[PDB]
């Protein structure tokens, strides 16, 4: 169930052009403390199948499945420790969110579909370079705080969801919000943010598990291919 | 016949890249007063088949077909009531039209293919947030007036056609006009509008049912796939 | 053979995202005086097969093949009359060339692949609206002069080649040159043109029939699909 | 082995959208001095198979394989002679890197994935036009110096790798870095470069042969097509 949900999540991120390459990371908190499920080393999101997700501990020992973990995902254990409510984490350097990261520009909530990130997207202004697991773990979990997402300056983004479906939903919506903002600002300059009270209400509406799960299942069907009409 | 046209209309909107999760809506005025045909809840445009369109009433009672309707489409009944000439409605948060909506920028008619929207695209400057069907329908039918289209600030757009073909035609042409304007303004600044007399003549020419229907049938063939040349 | 070249030309324009729709036009000068070969009415470039190209006269009578011609192509006879060297004409409202057209911005030759249009792209500043065949025919052939291409303000472009291969080559290179200029100007402002003497030499190099024909045959193979490596 | 690597490299360049007619070039230094392996004339990267790479000398004599080499690649022998450490060269006029070339804008290292080009991307400000193999070879090897890549003003780019995998990795990363910079600058103006010490460390990390080869093998699998989930 978990591995199948993760495989669909990777195919959705690939379909929506996150172009994660080998810089893409995904994890789901294990029922076993101190452990997490993750895509095995050397594979991209677009090729992930349920058998490519293994269960690993703090020392990168494979507890379940066949394969070796991407050591760059070890820092996810720090986020899971700081946030008991988080059950899934995605990190990519997706094209449009990375434009915001590179220009050191926070997300400005100015449209309905940008509201799942309203008061829910942190911004790490400092780029630590090539990191260590404990260095990145400490830095990201502190900068992220209680938010669902974080733009990592000169790097990419990270989403932290209460389920793999919510982390995927946040990743897709953040990338689309970033694209919308970059295209709008190039043509028209800085955006007028929407009213905070109305944006907080749209945030909770779009983040209802029923809508998150139905949207995830829709995107999952899309990855499998739809036959044209006869 | 109606459901078959609506299925093709959805595949055309999907082909021309209008997805934003499950935000896409389409309806056709039923022959039964006070009722409408619409895509059942949980489905995207790209997967719609004739059997996924059900006839629903003001209380979301499925009168024909199998399924539950998207409750977000209830406001369509207010538009149909205001506009007896309108028989099909499409609402999406398509990528380029949503850039105009987010930047609070009306469409500027400066090119031949933008003319079906000449003096035919309203602009709702106020974003109501998460709406109640009572208020959304009143707000949108009032702002739309007698026009064929409306850009909904911080939200997306809506098209209102005399047929499903015309609503689809207006949707594709609005999205392409918005893309053209955003790309032109990013490189060169504000556009010079074309002469109003010539634009109104091109508007009526491009909106002739023979041209609207032939274009819709062409796009329908495209969605089915074309075999390469041998 | 002529119709097979035209069928491949249409598939190439479709592959390279000219999104010609029903606004796309293509012709080849007939061996019979006062006649031309053209895509029959109601069809897009992406679906054109050799049997869809019919021979037509000044009164739109079908002399060869099955079908009715697009009456909007009648003005091509005026271009053929003004230019005995021209044997093929393509007119589309392709996405990037139409940005230049809409912003009333001539092409600025600043890169190797833009040189086939160096001193070879006219600009019609006046938009005549919905035209008459004699009106458009006289206007375009006079504005085009002895050039291979013309940007038609608020409309699109037209290419005029000594062969169908050259008209196709000019269409693809003009669309790509326009995309390059719009992207460069949005990020960095107005371009510095390359030296005219060196650009005229690159123009003649890239316009050698051997290179035009080999590039056309390459694009033709691409439209047919290439099997992945095993 | 070398021919198979080159075939995959071409399919990767094609997948990552680097086409510009038949302007694409690729070579690998032969084990025989004074000779190189290259894609035979008239073929694009997307259709290359192992049998399309032939070994040729300075006079374009085919020493191995069947076919005629692209004479435009003759200048690659000058780069190989100047740089014993370089074993593969790629030259294309890819869309985004060519925007930087056309606007005479050097790459600004402001993001993690741009670091393989940190202090490793030369800029040739002078455009020589249609060149002789003679002067082109001298001009590009002098401007390239000891770097891995060079932006060629008003032309495109060239990458020079210690292996075909590294040349491919540098091309993909340069094209993506250029896209990121052009999109960021259009919306937000000039970028703030990352710290040089941290960028040099990320440069060496991302350029480790284990990472270069694993990424190349991943992209190779992607070109072959991945079946959707069941
Ligand atoms: Fe990363
Ligand atoms: Fe909506
Ligand atoms: Fe036209
Ligand atoms: Fe070149």
Numbering used by the authors:
A (entry chain B), B (entry chain A), C (entry chain D), D (entry chain C): 29 to 258
Please quote the paper that reports this structure.
Here, we report the first X-ray crystal structure of a novel dioxygenase, AfPOD, at 1.76 Å resolution. The final structure model of the AfPOD tetramer contains 920 amino acid residues, 693 water molecules, and 4 iron ions. The N-terminal region (Met1-Arg28) and the C-terminal region (Lys259-Arg261) of each subunit showed no apparent electron density. AfPOD has a tetrameric structure with approximate dimensions of 60 × 40 × 80 Å3. The anomalous difference Fourier maps revealed that the metal ion coordinated by three His residues was confirmed to be an iron ion, as expected from a previous biochemical analysis. In subunit A, the iron ion is located at a depth of about 8 Å at the bottom of an active site pocket with an opening of about 16 Å long and 8 Å wide at the boundary to the adjacent subunit B. Imidazole nitrogen atoms of His119, His121, and His183 and oxygen atoms of three water molecules (W1, W2, and W3) coordinate the iron ion, forming an octahedral arrangement. The α1-β1 loop (Glu45-Ala51), which is highly conserved among PODs, is also located near the iron center and is fixed by hydrogen bonding between the main-chain carbonyl oxygen of Ala51 and the iron-coordinated water 2 at distances of 2.5  Å. A 14 Å-long tunnel with a 3.5 Å diameter opening at the central cavity extends along the interface between the subunit molecules to the iron center. Notably, the α1-β1 loop (Glu45-Ala51) forms part of the tunnel in subunits B and D. However, the tunnel is blocked by a conformational change of the Glu47 in subunits A and C, which probably prevents the passage of oxygen molecules.
The enzyme responsible for the core function of heterotrophic nitrification is pyruvic oxime dioxygenase (POD). POD is a non-heme, Fe(II)-dependent enzyme that catalyzes the dioxygenation of pyruvic oxime to produce pyruvate and nitrite. Bacteria of the genera Alcaligenes and Pseudomonas are known to perform heterotrophic nitrification, which produces nitrite from ammonia using pyruvate oxime (PO) as an intermediate metabolite. PODs have additional sequences at the N-terminus consisting of 20–30 amino acid residues that are not present in class II aldolases, corresponding to the disordered region of AfPOD in its crystal structure.
